[PDB]
Design a protein around this ligand. Structure first.
Ligand SMILES: [Mg+2]
Lengths: 121, 206, 312, 65
């Protein structure tokens, strides 16, 4: 079985978290730079870590992945979080109310436009 | 008392009735809810949207009463309310938790995410049952947004609405953010509409 | 004029990391690849075969990154990740001189005019300049990140007063060196990601540099300014300048894009089809170079193929 | 594993009492960071170097000599 241990996975996770504008989807250049960017005591571990980072680059290039939020990711999610529509979906588009909604307004004593429509079972 | 300018203004009544906050749960009804008004056919109950306003005004007075603003905590494990509580976090201190509560956050002082509030606000008491329970251990008031079937155990001030709704969670969190900011000093005009758009407090599917 | 399909060249067991040509023989093509070897080709000017390899060069213990040819078409130089450079001839293989002293990989080697000396940009953040006897006459520092690509400029005048080289590393900044004084003369800043390729125009005045963000932004080192920036909207791997006519080619991730830079538009967006390869990423060119005549453009793809595009 | 031979010192002594003999076994794992000879850390311990944050250049600027 080629399941990778958590020491390999977390070392790969920390490199992705920290050095996205860096190492790419090629294993050979990733191994040649993860050796000096991280002090790893074993060559077997270094190839395992550099291998899983490349597998993470392939996963990153096709949609977002969970557990990873690097420097270009959280700025992407906040820009889409900053949607300010001008259509004003809560505002009036023409309102429709039932019979039971209509007496609520006049019992409160407020003046609103209501288009009463009946609903029955 | 009140200077009688905090009553339900007509355009806010338009916002509440267009975000569909007036309709509640089905013929399920807990006796802890006298906000029910004139049960509609097809098994729908109408919430007296007037009564939600003083409860939102009263809840806003609780949050503004806390000296330090970053100790109030907004909780929403519902998928319809993480954007609302995060936007509530931006406009006030209001240190949020969205998603998983990570039990041991109010107890368990050696947690990395150990938070001690003086007030918590929860979107749904049935889905944030860990938040209200942990607040029952460490002496903390809670403010909930309640349906007409919500588990109101260990729950203080409650704002009756529909947690099943899409727009109602966003608007009520927006209205709560508006009043606590007016009371604190961020807004100076009572009649101003607080020009940031109410559609900011809405979850998105993609 | 439109570049079209001419043929494919299968002579490797790895990505063709470099292509180089010499004006001495138009039918020659040197190709370094990931299989620790160099394949010189012989071209016949025919259908999809296009011809056969002539000599296979072996002796490197790692990936041969960059290969170059001299003006006479005989001597060849290879930059390989085995911390050494090797000087060959296309006659009988026969490595003349090794060049050792780098403590890490070396990306790009380059030969000056008249076979005078050689420069080499390596991964130990140095630019080592070597004699042809194997003696490193000078070592240059100052790069914080390790260099990715170096090149000499082609002097339009036949050795007017001096020769200069240029450097590009992963530090988002381009150096310009005069090795006659072993001094730095120009820092070229404006890149936002790591630069992975740069190329000087045959006119000896225009410098094109490009990186991971995929912008190809231009410099004129004669005036030491910046003209503009245009993007291929994907990662780009190598650049090439046409020797005769005004074109600029870029080896992108989606494929190859050739630019007509006098009115600055795209031309045809070269996208060859590889008989499948649908689920994963499509193969892309990693190294390309225009021919001596400029009517043929060779590109080294990842799937063991050197592809040739020729104007009609 | 090999770090046990590298980082752990062991000793065994016999203590004679009037009721019999006691056995004393002392194992000391030292700090790998202050090893001063051979390895400096455990093999499974990686160390990610913190980078240097840098703002974008935002404009093509030329620095000449
Ligand atoms: Mg697969």
């Amino acid at each position: 079985g080629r399941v990778r241990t958590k020491t390999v996975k977390r070392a790969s996770k920390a490199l992705i978290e920290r050095y996205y504008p860096k190492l790419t989807l090629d294993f050979q250049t990733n191994k040649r730079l993860c050796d000096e960017i991280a002090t790893i005591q074993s060559k077997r571990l270094r190839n395992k870590i550099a291998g899983y980072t490349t597998h993470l680059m392939k996963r990153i290039q096709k949609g977002p992945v969970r557990g990873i939020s690097f420097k270009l990711q959280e700025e992407e999610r906040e820009r889409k979080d900053q949607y300010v529509p001008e259509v004003s979906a809560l505002d009036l588009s023409r309102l429709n109310v039932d019979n039971q909604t209509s007496d609520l307004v006049k019992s409160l004593g407020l003046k609103l436009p209501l288009s009463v429509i009946n609903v029955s079972a | 008392s009140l200077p009688a300018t905090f009553d339900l203004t007509p355009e806010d009544a338009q916002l509440l009735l267009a975000a569909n906050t007036h309709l509640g749960a089905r013929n399920v009804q807990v006796h802890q809810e006298p906000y029910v008004f004139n049960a509609r056919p097809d098994g729908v109950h109408v919430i007296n949207v007037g009564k939600t306003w003083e409860k939102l005004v009263l809840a806003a007075r609780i949050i503004a009463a806390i000296p330090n603003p970053e100790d109030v905590v907004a909780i929403s494990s519902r998928t319809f309310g993480q954007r609302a509580v995060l936007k509530f976090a931006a406009h006030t201190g209001a240190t949020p938790i969205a998603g998983r509560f990570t039990p041991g956050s109010f107890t368990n002082y050696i947690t990395r995410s150990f938070k001690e509030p003086r007030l918590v606000i929860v979107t749904d008491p049935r889905s944030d049952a860990q938040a209200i329970k942990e607040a029952s251990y460490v002496n903390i008031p809670v403010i909930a947004l309640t349906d007409l079937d919500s588990p109101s155990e260990f729950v203080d001030v409650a704002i009756p609405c529909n947690n099943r709704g899409k727009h109602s969670i966003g608007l009520i969190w927006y209205l709560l953010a508006r009043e606590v900011l007016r009371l604190r000093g961020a807004l100076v005009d009572r009649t101003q509409p607080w020009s940031i758009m109410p559609d900011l407090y809405f979850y998105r599917d993609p | 004029e439109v570049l079209v399909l001419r043929g494919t060249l299968e002579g490797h067991n790895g990505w063709v990391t470099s292509l180089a040509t010499s004006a001495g023989q138009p039918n020659l093509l040197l190709s370094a690849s990931r299989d620790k070897t160099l394949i010189s080709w012989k071209l016949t000017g025919d259908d999809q075969k296009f011809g056969v390899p002539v000599r296979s060069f072996k002796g490197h213990s790692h990936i041969v990154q960059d290969c170059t040819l001299t003006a006479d078409g005989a001597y060849a130089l290879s930059a390989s990740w085995d911390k050494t450079l090797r000087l060959w001839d296309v006659a009988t293989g026969e490595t003349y001189q090794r060049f050792v002293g780098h403590k890490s990989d070396v990306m790009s080697v380059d030969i000056d005019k008249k076979a005078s000396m050689i420069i080499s940009g390596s991964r130990d953040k140095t630019i080592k300049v070597w004699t042809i006897k194997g003696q490193c006459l000078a070592t240059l520092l100052g790069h914080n990140d390790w260099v990715s690509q170096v090149r000499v400029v082609p002097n339009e005048k036949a050795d007017d007063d001096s020769v200069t080289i240029i450097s590009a590393g992963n530090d988002k900044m381009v150096k310009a060196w005069n090795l006659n004084q072993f001094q730095i003369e120009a820092d070229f800043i404006g890149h936002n990601s790591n630069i992975n390729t740069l190329t000087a125009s045959p006119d000896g005045t225009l410098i094109a540099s490009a990186g991971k963000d995929g912008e190809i932004m231009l410099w004129n080192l004669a005036a030491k300014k910046a003209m503009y920036t245009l993007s291929a909207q994907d990662e780009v791997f190598s650049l090439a300048f046409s020797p005769n006519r005004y074109w600029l080619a870029a080896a992108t991730a989606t494929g190859i894009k050739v630019f007509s830079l006098d009115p600055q538009y795209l031309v045809d967006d070269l996208r060859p089809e590889f008989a499948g390869y649908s689920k994963a990423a499509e193969p892309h060119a990693v190294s390309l170079a225009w021919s001596a005549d400029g009517q043929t453009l060779f590109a080294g793809y990842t799937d063991n193929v050197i592809r040739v595009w020729q104007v009609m | 594993g090999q770090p046990v031979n590298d980082f752990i010192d062991t000793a065994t002594r016999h203590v004679l009492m009037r009721q019999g003999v006691l056995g004393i076994k002392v194992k000391i794992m030292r700090d790998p960071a202050k090893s001063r000879t051979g390895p400096k850390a455990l093999p499974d311990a990686v160390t990610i170097i913190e980078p240097k944050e840098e703002e974008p250049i935002l404009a093509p600027s030329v620095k000449d000599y």
